[PDB]
């Protein structure tokens, strides 16, 4: 809170936290795509897809 209740320090710091965290999400998305590239996506049959691939 920055004090003894939800007050002016609370609202000024919540806005500055709020601008930052969207840019941390954008870096977790890059790490998320990197982990998908090494094995690729699955398919609704649940078997291997290396026999039939299209770009």
Ligand X SMILES: CCCCCCCCCCCCCCC(=O)OCCCOP(=O)(O)OC[C@@H](O)COP(=O)(O)OCCCOC(C)=O
Can you tell me which of 9, 12, 42, 49 binds ligand HEM, judged by CB under 6 A? Answer: 42
φ/ψ (deg, to 5) at 9: -60, -30
Cα separation of 3 and 28, whole Å? 33
Cα separation of 2 and 10, whole Å? 6
39 belongs to an annotated ligand binding site? no
Give least dist CB 17 to ligand X, A.
20
Can you tell me which of 8, 41, 48, 50 binds ligand HEM, judged by CB under 6 A? Answer: 41
Contacts with ligand HEM, residue ranges (CB under 6 A): 29, 32, 36, 41-42
């Amino acid at each position: 809170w920055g004090g003894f209740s939800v007050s002016n320090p609370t609202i000024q710091r919540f806005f500055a936290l709020h601008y930052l965290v969207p840019f941390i999400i954008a870096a977790m998305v890059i790490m998320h795509l990197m982990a998908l590239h090494i094995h690729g996506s699955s398919n609704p049959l649940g078997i291997t897809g290396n026999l039939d691939r299209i770009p």
